[PDB]
Amino acid sequence: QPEPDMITIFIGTWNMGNAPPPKKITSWFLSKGQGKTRDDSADYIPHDIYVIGTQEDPLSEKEWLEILKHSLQEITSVTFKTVAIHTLWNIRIVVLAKPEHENRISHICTDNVKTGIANTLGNKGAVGVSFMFNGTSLGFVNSHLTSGSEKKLRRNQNYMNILRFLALGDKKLSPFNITHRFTHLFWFGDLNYRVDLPTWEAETIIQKIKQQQYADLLSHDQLLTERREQKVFLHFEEEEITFAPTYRFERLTRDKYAYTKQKATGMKYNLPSWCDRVLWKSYPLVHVVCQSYGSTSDIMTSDHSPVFATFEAGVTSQFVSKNGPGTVDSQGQIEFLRCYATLKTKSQTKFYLEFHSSCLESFVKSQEGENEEGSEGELVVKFGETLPKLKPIISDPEYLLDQHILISIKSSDSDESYGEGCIALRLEATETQLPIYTPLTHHGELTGHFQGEIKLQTSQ
Numbered sequence: 204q205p206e207p208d209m210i211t212i213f214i215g216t217w218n219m220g221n222a223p224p225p226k227k228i229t230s231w232f233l234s235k236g237q238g239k240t241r242d243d244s245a246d247y248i249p250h251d252i253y254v255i256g257t258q259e260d261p262l263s264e265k266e267w268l269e270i271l272k273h274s275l276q277e278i279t280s281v282t283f284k285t286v287a288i289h290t291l292w293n294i295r296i297v298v299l300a301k302p303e304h305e306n307r308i309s310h311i312c313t314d315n316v317k318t319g320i321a322n323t324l325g326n327k328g329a330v331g332v333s334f335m336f337n338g339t340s341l342g343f344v345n346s347h348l349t350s351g352s353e354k355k356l357r358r359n360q361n362y363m364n365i366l367r368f369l370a371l372g373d374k375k376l377s378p379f380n381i382t383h384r385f386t387h388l389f390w391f392g393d394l395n396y397r398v399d400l401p402t403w404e405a406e407t408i409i410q411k412i413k414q415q416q417y418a419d420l421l422s423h424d425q426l427l428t429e430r431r432e433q434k435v436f437l438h439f440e441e442e443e444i445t446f447a448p449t450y451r452f453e454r455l456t457r458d459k460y461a462y463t464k465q466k467a468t469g470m471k472y473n474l475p476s477w478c479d480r481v482l483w484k485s486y487p488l489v490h491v492v493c494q495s496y497g498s499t500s501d502i503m504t505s506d507h508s509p510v511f512a513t514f515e516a517g518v519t520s521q522f523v524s525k526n527g528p529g530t531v532d533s534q535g536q537i538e539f540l541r542c543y544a545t546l547k548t549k550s551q552t553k554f555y556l557e558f559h560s561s562c563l564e565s566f567v568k569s570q571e572g573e574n575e576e577g578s579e580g581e582l583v584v585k586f587g588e589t590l591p592k593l594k595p596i597i598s599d600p601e602y603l604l605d606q607h608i609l610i611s612i613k614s615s616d617s618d619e620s621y622g623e624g625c626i627a628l629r630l631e632a633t634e635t636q637l638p639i640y641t642p643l644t645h646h647g648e649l650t651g652h653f654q655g656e657i658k659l660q661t662s663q
């Protein structure tokens with residue numbers, strides 16, 4: 204039985220509003236309702252992995268797992284295996300996979316982050332799961348961020364705390380946060396960003412939604428505007444939104460948005476908003492295609508509608524050769540030519556690089572670079588032709604061209620990373636000098652750039 208080179212992944216996010224679900228939730232897992240929906244001809248075809256994120260979840264883990272497994276068995280006639288379940292307060296993540304994948308999945312990690320301080324610590328935060336699927340690392344984050352239209356900057360702060368402190372994936376990747384640890388990272392939840400229009404415009408917004416005219420609402424969505432201004436979710440993708448706002452509904456119908464201020468809301472307005480979202484970030488030049496992004500219309504126990512997204516995702520096989528794993532493949536090498544880092548720092552420490560990759564036996568430290576002053580104020584760290592030649596464990600081009608090199612630039616004085624990025628080895632040519640580039644981030648914000656040339660030697 205051949206190892207897959209693609210899988211499909213279901214992502215669900217639902218703020219359940221502290222209510223039990225209705226008897227039937229199959230529409231969610233079938234990607235049926237509003238938006239980019241899944242073709243009826245696929246309804247019996249199971250996804251490889253289902254990742255369910257809930258917020259305000261009133262159920263026990265056992266109670267929700269039974270509902271989810273029942274739901275999938277009714278759709279697919281497959282009994283899914285539980286990969287992981289993790290709950291923080293009423294924020295939960297469940298990962299289910301087809302039984303045929305049980306031996307393909309390993310290195311399962313879970314963690315949570317509690318956001319806020321004192322008053323604002325005790326119900327918001329995130330849970331996450333990561334694992335390896337054959338040679339491919341997968342990460343999943345379900346976050347419930349701060350509520351309220353006038354708290355976008357708190358949400359952004361909650362995002363940075365979660366990506367700094369959530370401890371998933373390979374702990375040896377010490378300079379790297381979750382935004383660099385995975386081939387594919389999915390981040391979803393009740394992110395709680397709102398449509399920023401005046402309160403007086405509530406009925407006008409409702410009208411627009413009834414006309415399925417979302418453009419003038421999406422142009423005020425705080426998540427899209429904060430992402431455009433590089434305030435949050437830098438280097439993440441989101442499919443185009445073509446479904447109505449998923450919050451805030453009267454329960455037991457979807458005919459009414461409940462937006463007016465009430466004692467129950469802390470006298471806050473809840474204008475119709477796209478609170479419930481799925482974003483992703485995959486390594487450069489890895490296949491990832493969104494095949495659905497939408498909301499259900501028939502699950503009405505909460506003041507939010509469930510959101511679904513599905514993905515095709517490239518995966519690779521657990522490569523063995525006669526050499527690697529457990530030795531080098533002398534035939535293989537990676538050379539960096541004429542490389543330099545451009546950093547936004549005011550610091551004047553010397554810097555060195557670390558190269559990390561599962562195609563290396565262990566990470567590689569460079570010599571210190573040569574600091575120059577750039578034209579428009581910046582620090583340029585030149586490495587020239589000084590960088591160590593990297594010796595991959597396997598030289599077969601079918602393996603090596605699918606790998607990635609994570610780069611950290613670290614201060615010699617503190618050994619702290621000032622920037623992290625990722626280079627694909629999926630090159631147009633081998634034995635040929637080719638341009639490479641990555642932005643560098645630290646704590647998920649832009650700190651610089653790394654560019655130069657690469658020369659990759661494979662066994663072919």
Ligand SMILES: O=C(Nc1ccccc1)Nc1cccnc1
Nearest residue numbers: 427428430431432437438439440
């Ligand atoms: O995010 C954007 N591009 C991108 C995404 C991932 C990696 C690198 C670049 N563009 C964007 C964002 C928000 C509004 N309009 C455009």
